[PDB]
Amino acid sequence: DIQMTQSPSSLSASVGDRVTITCRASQSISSYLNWYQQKPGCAPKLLIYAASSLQSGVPSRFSGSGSGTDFTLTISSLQPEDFATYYCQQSYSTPLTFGQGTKVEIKGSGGSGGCPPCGGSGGEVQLLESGGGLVQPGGSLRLSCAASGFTFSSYAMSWVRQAPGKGLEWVSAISGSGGSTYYADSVKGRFTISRDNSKNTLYLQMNSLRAEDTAVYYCAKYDGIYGELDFWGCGTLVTVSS
Structure with a gap:
């Protein structure tokens, strides 16, 4: 690390x-x-x-x-x-x-608000997230990320999470073909990233969920050769507690 x-x-x-x-x-x-x-x-x-x-x-x-x-x-x-x-x-x-x-x-300033375009209600690229919700410790949950607007199989994909009020944490990544996968230490043996290139969908199957897994989970598309993530899903909240 x-x-x-x-x-x-x-x-x-x-x-x-x-x-x-x-x-x-x-x-x-x-x-x-x-x-x-x-x-x-x-x-x-x-x-x-x-x-x-x-x-x-x-x-x-x-x-x-x-x-x-x-x-x-x-x-x-x-x-x-x-x-x-x-x-x-x-x-x-x-x-x-x-x-x-x-x-x-x-610390006299004012912006128009606005979040960056994400999900399917942006432009160019679309990444529709679904699957979040409430689960009890030990349980399971499957997140989906349906992509459109680009050649899905030409891009690696990533899952990034953010616990409430804390920072971004990288979870997993998968190569364009699906042949290579990578995981954060804290999720190995419990999460599985996968993709269906015929349906243009990214998945994250989670089991043995812990309270420390409670976070907003983002899917993100890679671009170029330097590992940058140029388009993100809007996020879906996963809550693990009694």
Whole structure:
């Protein structure tokens, strides 16, 4: 496990400020470092991939730098819509690991709201999630992710979860053909990722669920060669308790 550490954990700033967020890796990861923005109740949004490449559609005030072990995300002029939490993620070695996140807070500002397009009610790509709900400890649950708008078998897919009020956690990934699968340490022997390329659907079958598995679960589609996830499902809540 490569440990990603962000600093600071939280941050107060004003519209127009220069904000910089640092991400440190416990070993060299070359440029396999990606940056995500997430607002409360929204799916994450890809900002930077390959350490410094700006994702199509992201304003130029966002920039990334660094290689090896130390990386920095810069917002040159903070805007009302930029108040959110920011995560780095290494795609150098499995298990893929996120930083703990940096919350950028207000302290005279106002945004239009809005979450990034997700699910089937976005555009271009669609990823319809279903299957969440309530289960008791030891039980099971199957999540589905129906894809459309792209050649499903040409893209690896991922499951990422987020416990209430905590950070993004990588769960599992599967290659485009389904021939290779990868799992976080905490879910091996209990979860199974799979895909039906004839039906264009991604699955996560879970059993022996624990209370620590309670989270919002996202399916996400990979893109390119640097392990970035450019489109996400809206999330489905899985609750494990008595």
